[PDB]
Structures are given as structure tokens and as C-alpha cells.
């Protein structure tokens, strides 16, 4: 870890001198709450058929999309107070912060 520096590293390495990997790329996310899995450590809720979550059946993510999210395209409301750039900047900014790889 260099004693004096003017520029950022590409990886974020060395930004926090005490814990040099914090904020750096290809590292595990921090957790604000402990994880909740079927088996307590890896299986996601909805994995095992018949296994309830907090005393209730687990709703199919698609059924939730269909029953709450779904709407008729025509009946759309435009934001009087926001441009589409507001949306697009959010995605561009999201792409500066996080990317969760999958295999």
C-alpha cells in the first residue's frame, strides 16, 4: 500500500488504507442484515416444494409480477416533473457501483 498517492487505483484497492479491499472490485458485498435462506445458509426461499417462509407459502415471483405489477400499456402516466434522462442516469450510475456476476 503506497504511503502517498494522487490517483485512484483501477480496482479501488488502497482507497481505505486500514482495510485496503473496501470498495475494491471482485469482493463480497457487505450485509446490513443476516441472510434468510431455506436451510439457513444457501437454498433460496421457493427452492423446496412445500417449504413455507415465516409460516406462509412462498408466492411465485411471476405470480406477484402478474397480480401486482401488470398494467394496460395505454393507461401509462408520464412524469410531469422528470425527464427520461433521470431514468438513464440512474442505470449509468448503477453501472458505476454494482454488478453481480452469475456463472
Amino acid at each position: 500500500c503506497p504511503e502517498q498517492d494522487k490517483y485512484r487505483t483501477i480496482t479501488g484497492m488502497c482507497n481505505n488504507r486500514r482495510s485496503p479491499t473496501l470498495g475494491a472490485s471482485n469482493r463480497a458485498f457487505v450485509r446490513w442484515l443476516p441472510a434468510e435462506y431455506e436451510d439457513g445458509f444457501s437454498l433460496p426461499y421457493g427452492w423446496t416444494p412445500g417449504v413455507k417462509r415465516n409460516g406462509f407459502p412462498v408466492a411465485l415471483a411471476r405470480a406477484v409480477s402478474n397480480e401486482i405489477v401488470r398494467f394496460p400499456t395505454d393507461q401509462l402516466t408520464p412524469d410531469q416533473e422528470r425527464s427520461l434522462m433521470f431514468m438513464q442516469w440512474g442505470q449509468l450510475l448503477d453501472h458505476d457501483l454494482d454488478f453481480t456476476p452469475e456463472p
Binding site: N15, S25, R31, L33, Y37, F56, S83, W89, H95, T100
Partner: protein, 464 residues
């Protein structure tokens, strides 16, 4: 074989088909899903967690990259001008374009079999996901080379490494300025902005700057803003024919639309003069992303809101009431209680029909169901998740543009002028930009101004 199989074997976690589905009539089919990479592959000790492939900082790593080999490959290594490499095949009316990527199964060639236009190469792998995103990337690459070109005429004794870094530090600082001064207040609203992001004092080394797992699903609130078309506009902000109101289901990975359909200028004009989609409890997300996500490049069109919910379960994220408690917010138990919190008992009864209990509501579903905070676009829950993340990203960044030593007092004064409209002027053929704030200005000509009125960033304080 997640892309083709329905069998639930690791690493596959496909979304099963409900009866009487509005589109997928075959219940033996599914929505493909790959479980996010474990931080600790195959452990029976550690509680499964996932990886962030990027730098959490607002350092414009979506331009420079987050890994050394990619970072070099994005830089023009032919001269000592410290430039970012450009496309050597096509140009947007003279102006620079992102270089092409050498990919195995390139999805951008699938979008138009006769165009033979591949994906673009940028700091972040998702550059070609939508032309609106590619445009923003094309804009920033131009700024890096605009800054290093201007920086050379200022300090000729400076070498390539001194030119690249200084132009990188400026771009990064501009991203923080637009984000914190213009973007975030319009997301959080005045009250949350004051609570979660009070005035910057100085960098603190005990502030964890990492992205929390929940932020990755919570920041997806952005999906509710998504308009069902890509809006292209002419030099006079009038619909640009042919294809001025193109559906998003035909724009994903459609990089050929940048290379063969008028460049980034009709796209960038569209984001300035088209209103965002508003989030209403009876109008959460459009069918272009809910039923036709990546229709062209996949066996089946995906459901973004449903992938958001499966991802929260993959990541083992606690439900709605757990996060409500985390934020210091009340946790409804009953349908009447949820009704009061959501200010909508129609939705509460619906959310109880699916989930059974407010404890099980998926973070994204619960998050986006809350009434919007005054002059903000998120409810009390998401404002807390989003606000806390961004505070840590600012307060725990050693290279934050406002920290002592990062920039000189004069550089800070020069940087404070910048705006996204000016950057759009400084790098495109667009003569009529938006009046600040760019994120609120959505109507032509009422909210629009001319380039001469916009003050450019003066690099006089950068003279060594």
C-alpha cells in the same frame, strides 16, 4: 444449462409458471435464472453471499473499468496523449464512438442479422444493453479525450499517464457532482436528502464504502421509471422518422441503431425532452420489460420485476418488515396496518393475497409499493436504503472531489460549474441543451436553452 433447461439443479433457479398466465400458456416452460456467483463456492460453513464485480465508489469505473487488464485495453496505447481508445470502423458524424468488443456469442449481432454490428467495449460490460445507456457511455468517452486534449494544450510537458489520470479525476468528479447535487435530491426528496445526506464535512476512514447486498435489489426502483419506447428527436426536437417511437423490446442489445440510425444525438435529445414513466400503485412497470425483456436475443422474453424478486431470494434478502425495522420504520402485521402504511387497502389485500404476511413481501415489491416521498420518486423504505448507501459512498471515499487534498480550492470552484447539459454541448452536435436541473426539465421548448448561455468548465486552475 439455465438458458434452455427448467430443471432446478445448481446453478439454476428457474422461475416456475403460474396457472392462467397472461403470456406463457405452457406450464412446463419457465423464466431462466442463474443463481448469482457465491463468494465462497461450495461451503457448508459460510452463509452464502454474492460478489460485486465493480468498485463501489463513484469513480466512473463504468468508463475506466474496475480491473487492470480491461483498463489498459480501453486506453489508446499508440501515443503519449493519454487518450481512451475509440471505434476504428464507424464515427457519429465525425465525433468518436466506443470501440467494438471481440465476443464469442455476441448478442448485438442477433438484433439485426444483416447489420453485422457487434457490442461495444466500455468500463462496464453492460454498455450495449440499451442505446440510451450506450449514448451516455459514448458521451463520457468523448469527455475523457476532450479533457486530455485540452489538458495537453495547457501543460505540454505532461506525459500520457499524467494526461489520462487528470482527465479520469475530472470525469469521476463530474459523475459525483451530477449524482449528488442534481440526481439524488430528485430521488430522495428534500426531507430524506437532509436526513440521509447532510452537508459533506470531510472523508472519514471508519465509513464502510461497500455496496450492501440489499442496495443491488433496492436501486432497481429505477425499473418503475422505464418508458416503453426509445424516443428519437431531430435538430428541432420533433419526432425523427424513420422509427421515432421504437419499442424497448426491439432496442435491447440493438447497438446497430447507434452505428446505422443517426448516432447518439437523436437518442440524447430524446432523454432530455421525453418525460419519465411515473410510478403509480396500479401502474408499477411496463410490459416491454415485464413480458418482453430481451425477446430478440433469447429463447423467451424475460420478466424484469419477477427477476428482481427471484434475485432477492437468491441473495437471501430478508423480507419487507425486516428492512422496515432496520430503517427505524413501523412494521405492519395486518392487512389494515399494511393498508395504512401503503395508503391503499386495494394493494394491501393484493399484497396479502400473494405473500400472506408483510414479513414475506420481497424487498423490491414492498419498496416500490410505498407512496412516493414529497418531491422524491421513492417511499420511506427505499429512501433509507438508497440514502444510506450514497452517504457511505461519499463519506468513505478518500478521493471524494470535496475532500482536503483531492482538488485545489480553485479546481473545486471550476468543477462546481459543470452540468450534464454543458457536457452534452461540449461533446455532441446538440445546440439546444436542457435548463438545469436536467432530470426535471422534460418539455421542449419551455424547459430548454441554447449553448451560449451555458458556462463551460475552465481548466485554468489545472495549469502547472
Amino acid at each position: 444449462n439455465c438458458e434452455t433447461s427448467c430443471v432446478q439443479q445448481p446453478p439454476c433457479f428457474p422461475l416456475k409458471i403460474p396457472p392462467n398466465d397472461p403470456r406463457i400458456k405452457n406450464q412446463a416452460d419457465c423464466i431462466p435464472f442463474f443463481r448469482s456467483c457465491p463468494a465462497c463456492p461450495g461451503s457448508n460453513i459460510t452463509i452464502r453471499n454474492q460478489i460485486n464485480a465493480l468498485t463501489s465508489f463513484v469513480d466512473a469505473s463504468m468508463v475506466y473499468g474496475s480491473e487492470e487488464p480491461l483498463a489498459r485495453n480501453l486506453r489508446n496505447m499508440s501515443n503519449q496523449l493519454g487518450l481512451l481508445a475509440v471505434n476504428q470502423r464507424f464515427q457519429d458524424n465525425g465525433r468518436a464512438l466506443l470501440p467494438f468488443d471481440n465476443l464469442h456469442d455476441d448478442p448485438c449481432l442477433l438484433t439485426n442479422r444483416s447489420a453485422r454490428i457487434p457490442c461495444f467495449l466500455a468500463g462496464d460490460t453492460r454498455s450495449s444493453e440499451m442505446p440510451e445507456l450506450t449514448s451516455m457511455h459514448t458521451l463520457l468517452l468523448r469527455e475523457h479525450n476532450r479533457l486530455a486534449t485540452e489538458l495537453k494544450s495547457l501543460n505540454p510537458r505532461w506525459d500520457g499517464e499524467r494526461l489520462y489520470q487528470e482527465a479520469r479525476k475530472i470525469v469521476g468528479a463530474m459523475v459525483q457532482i451530477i449524482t449528488y447535487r442534481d440526481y439524488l435530491p430528485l430521488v430522495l426528496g428534500p426531507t430524506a436528502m437532509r436526513k440521509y445526506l447532510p452537508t459533506y464535512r470531510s472523508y472519514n476512514d471508519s465509513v464502510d464504502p461497500r455496496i450492501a447486498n440489499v442496495f443491488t435489489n433496492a436501486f432497481r426502483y429505477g425499473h418503475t421509471l422505464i418508458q416503453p419506447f426509445m424516443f428519437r428527436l431531430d435538430n428541432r426536437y420533433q419526432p425523427m422518422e424513420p422509427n421515432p417511437r421504437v419499442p424497448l423490446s426491439r432496442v435491447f442489445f440493438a447497438s446497430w441503431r447507434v452505428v446505422l440510425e443517426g448516432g447518439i444525438d437523436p437518442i440524447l435529445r430524446g432523454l432530455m425532452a421525453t418525460p419519465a414513466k411515473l410510478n403509480r400503485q396500479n401502474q408499477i412497470a411496463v410490459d416491454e420489460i415485464r413480458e418482453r425483456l430481451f425477446e430478440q436475443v433469447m429463447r423467451i422474453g424475460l420478466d424484469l420485476p419477477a427477476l428482481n424478486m427471484q434475485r432477492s431470494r437468491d441473495h437471501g434478502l430478508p423480507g419487507y418488515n425486516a428492512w422496515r425495522r432496520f430503517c427505524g420504520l413501523p412494521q405492519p402485521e395486518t392487512v389494515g396496518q399494511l393498508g395504512t402504511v401503503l395508503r391503499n387497502l386495494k394493494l394491501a389485500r393484493k399484497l396479502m393475497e400473494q405473500y400472506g404476511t408483510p414479513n414475506n413481501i420481497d424487498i423490491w415489491m414492498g419498496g416500490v409499493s410505498e407512496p412516493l416521498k414529497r418531491k422524491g420518486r421513492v417511499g420511506p423504505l427505499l429512501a433509507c436504503i438508497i440514502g444510506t448507501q450514497f452517504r457511505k459512498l461519499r463519506d468513505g471515499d478518500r478521493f471524494w472531489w470535496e475532500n482536503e487534498g483531492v482538488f485545489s480550492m480553485q479546481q473545486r470552484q471550476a468543477l462546481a460549474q459543470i452540468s450534464l447539459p454543458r457536457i452534452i454541448c461540449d461533446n455532441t452536435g446538440i445546440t439546444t441543451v436542457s435548463k438545469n436541473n436536467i432530470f426535471m426539465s422534460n418539455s421542449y421548448p419551455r424547459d430548454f436553452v441554447n449553448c451560449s448561455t451555458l458556462p463551460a468548465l475552465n481548466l485554468a486552475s489545472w495549469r502547472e
